[model samples]
Target: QGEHYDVIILGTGLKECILSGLLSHYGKKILVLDRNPYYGGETASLNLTNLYNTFKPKENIPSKYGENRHWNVDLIPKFILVGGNLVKILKKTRVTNYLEWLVVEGSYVYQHQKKGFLTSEKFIHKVPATDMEALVSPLLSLMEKNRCKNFYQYVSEWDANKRNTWDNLDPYKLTMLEIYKHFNLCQLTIDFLGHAVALYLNDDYLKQPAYLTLERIKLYMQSISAFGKSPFIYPLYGLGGIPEGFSRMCAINTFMLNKNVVDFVFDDDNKVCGIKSSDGEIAYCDKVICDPSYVMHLKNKIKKIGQVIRCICILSNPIPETNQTNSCQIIIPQNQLNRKSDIYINLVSFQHGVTLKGKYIAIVSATVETNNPIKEIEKPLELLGTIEEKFVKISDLYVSTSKKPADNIFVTSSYDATSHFETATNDLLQIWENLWGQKLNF
Candidate 1:
């Protein structure tokens, strides 16, 4: 006889685990499984030994680095906005009790000069979170600064439903490019606003309607004000702690681990009836939630969007010019690097309990535009000084093209290379809405 469950979640990744917790809270009997022995899947934190074994040859590692247990490097590095959706999820589910948070001290963007050795060289500038800071920013001249202040004021007072709030400008009717034109912002100011403030990966935001980018900018402002240091906050002990907390918040009926789902059984009606693990153990369930890895045939069903290249570097000291803060995020705009995608660098230190004292981890990542992914990230790497050790991995990002509602099998997309959880949490909420037939409120 097979054990029955309301939902069988394959993979212990953050996305899958969050679904399990939400479903369990709804009184559903859940069975969670993962092929790997540990949790987090794509988002797992690796100790030094696991880090060396997975990417670097052990011979290449210096012996003086000490014990492997001291390091907890996240494979998919991401931070949560203090006021973002994931924060809402944690608070709603009471997962906050299971985790601790450290505020990132600052958010910075890379600026490349054009005149001297420093001209071509890149330097990090703290992102202006308020209009006053923008007014005094050396990154912008007096004229650009005034333009930026006016634009920010417009965004601050923006209301789509209230026509009078627009000052006769229709944000919905205008494109983002038109909105920038109204402000008469220079290319440099627009680049900073689009990438550093709104967090768009590329220049596509310019072609979209102004409302979308304006909303994103508003979220950035809200998030930045929440902690008054940066728009992001990271959990102590790396992101691995996040899933573990959600797993604990799940119902007591949730079962199974270290099991691999090799095949899915469907009813005559083509609905997902259950899943069979590699060990021949069967779990009958009404629905299944999984990462893209479990559904290899899904590659054909979905569009193989692209790949993201990530490099994790171990450094002896904190990133320079971040006020030596224990944690920070530096964004390199695509135009500055003359690439198709933006680059992200997130650094955390031992203060968060992820590494040994006096040691730090700097994770650099970007969407791959060329065959040589390493070459694409070279410019971002140059911003960091000497690296004690480095690990790099490339993975595909997939998008589902069709809705297979009859199958009752929901798959999560791979996490993007962004330094925040906005997209991942959006994916989670959308999946929840699709499965539950209603939006997850609050």
Candidate 2:
């Protein structure tokens, strides 16, 4: 691990990698490090089957976990031009032709099904009809169990079930006519999560404006061909594959490692000049890209938009059986009322053909705000006893946070990051600028 580089970046989340990638293209020597071992930070895919495969009686070890079939990529896909173009061409030529592509590309309506259960890389599940007793009964019971009174009030007053209409509404153009009807209507119509990681979860951030939710919900209810034909494209390899690919590109020109940066040593001018590790290693840099979230009490100080959520699940197995990169179960309890998580189940995956490492998988979640992630996380976790719910036998759970720095050195200043995708991209663009001393094309 010799040192000598034009630039060094902290954190391997997408932002750092994007900057490193851009700088590499300009023929600059760079170094990127992450506190964690993997790329994509919160975006990394989880592996279910450990080498031991102890979940079962060890009886089915060789048969179940023995085949050595590991998930190469997470449900999220990487950017692939050739495959995307081909899919576009096929959609244009075929009857059903990439209907999914149209959902995002077309302006008819805005739609999001990020809880991964309903939408994923390989499959899409329509909102099951009320006719299905199995789906309806459990849904009804769960509605009651989670918060029955609230669900009842919503269905009774809003009549959301019978309200089957959207005369061309979107987050950008929700109607004032219906807005006044619901005192909280304005909250449902926010802008989309541009480049921020939240895009991987849900578009509910737009929910700040009810018209936006209406726009999305309208498409779900009114359009006959909307469910499976959405245009929300994902990367080809998987979410994790993206950072891995980015690492490959950066590794050639830059050194990569996992080391916790304990402190930053600034010059007499209070200008950042060096950094030290928990292990007492010291290093120098003309500039630094600080990319850690609230773990060290950074939640409120972070500049851009931020949010926190816990992803839990009792997957009958770890990854689903589709042998596909998708999860297929979403549960958005109507109890959320007008809250952010109410109508949105930020998690998304397809599980139909996939095999769970275990026989039962359950997912639970908690949320936080951009300005007050810790407070938000604290409240939700306390309300649900979030940690206690994870009985170890009931399910496996993981916590992830996506945050924006309070004072960004780059692209975030230019773009209004109302959403996760926007923020993440902006953060990345900033990194790119820091490395190349230039602006990114997009």
Candidate 3:
């Protein structure tokens, strides 16, 4: 006999779990499935043995790293802002009670400069989250410091309704370029503000309206205030716990594990009616939800957006000049190396329970630009002193064109290369609206 429900959700990834929790809270009967026996599909945190088996088993594996139970390394490494959407979702869903959170110690940026007129070196600078730190930033010149301060002050006090607040320029009509010029801000200042502070992945934001950049800056400042040093906060055990936490909130008898979607059943009207698992277990529901992996049969329905290359390395020592903190994020702006996208480096250590007592993990990733992805990250790899073992992979970013097609199927997009969960959250909320016809309250 086939089971019946209001919705059938496939994949236990963060997005799926989040929406599953929300729907179940709204009194919807839901059944969730994942091919993998464990939760957190792509975002799962693996222990040492599974990590080695999945990444680099051929290499001479380290013999002594304690037990695998101590490690909780994230497959898709990311951090959440203290006051960001992810945090809000956690609090609202009561997922916070299932996990412990920790503030990332510091956030740094790589500044590459010529050393002796020939050779060049990359230096790390703690991002200036406070006004005093901004003035003393090694990345800024004495004159540029004042210019940056002026720009920051304007953005801090900016209000669209108040004309005096905008330095007499209409924020809606003016480009970010105009605002930059108003303060006589140099190129580097703009780069730092765009990439480091606002967390833009590319230079495209510069040509757009100033309001977007202004809002991002204000959010960054607010995040800094919530946490002392940096705007990012990470969970103790890794992001894998996020999906598992949300999955726990689902209604009883609603989750199915280690089950693959063999196919979908549709009615004569061309609307989805049910899903069949590999084991012949059938789940009938009014609507079907799944990640892109299960929707490959509907190839034309998904849009292949772009590719991202991620390199995960096991380091014997912490990144130099970072005060040996357990966790941190370093950004290499596109303009610094004249690349199309910024490079992000994230390091997590034993303090976060993601590594052994004396070991660390570093993830370096960027949007793929050329055929040779490994070569693209060579410059950033120099920042990490010595890498014991490494693993690399390139992923295609995908997004569904419609939430509810004529087939009445909904699919979630692949996570992006950015170092945060904002993009994924946007997709989650959008999908929620598509199904319910009203915006999600949280």
Colliding residue pairs in candidate 1: 113-119
Question: Alpha carbon lDDT of residue 367, candidate 2?
Answer: 42
Residue-level error in angstroms, candidate 1, position 245: 0.5
lDDT at position 6, candidate 3: 93
C-alpha root-mean-square deviation, each candidate: 2.3, 12.4, 2.2
Output the TM-score of candidate 1.
0.93
Q: Which stretch of 10 consecutive residues in model 1 shows the poorest summed lDDT? A: 113-122
TM-score of each: 0.93, 0.47, 0.94
lDDT (tens digit, per residue) of candidate 1 on 1-442: 8799888898888898888878877778888888887888899988877888899764655666677776788998798877778888788777787888888888888887556654444488888867888888767888888888888888888886888888888877889999999989998888888888888777888988888988888788877776788888888888888777877777454535688778889899978898886788887989888888888864344567999989998898888777787888898888788887788999987877788888888999899899899999897887777788788899999876554456888888888989888889989888899887899988
Question: Which ten residues in a row are the worst by lDDT in model 2?
Answer: 189-198
Question: lDDT of each model, Cα atoms only?
Answer: 0.83, 0.36, 0.82
Looking at model 3, report the run of 10 residues with the lowest lDDT sum: 113-122
Candidate 3 lDDT by residue in tens digits, 1-442: 6789899998988889988888887789988888998888877789988888888777555777888888898888888877677777777777788888888888998776557665455477788866667777777888887777777777778876788887688878998888888888888777778888888877788789988888888888878876686899888889978877777777543677888888988898978899887787887889877888888886466898888888888899999888887899998888776787888889999978899989999999888888998898998898899998788878888889877676768888988777777778888888888897898675
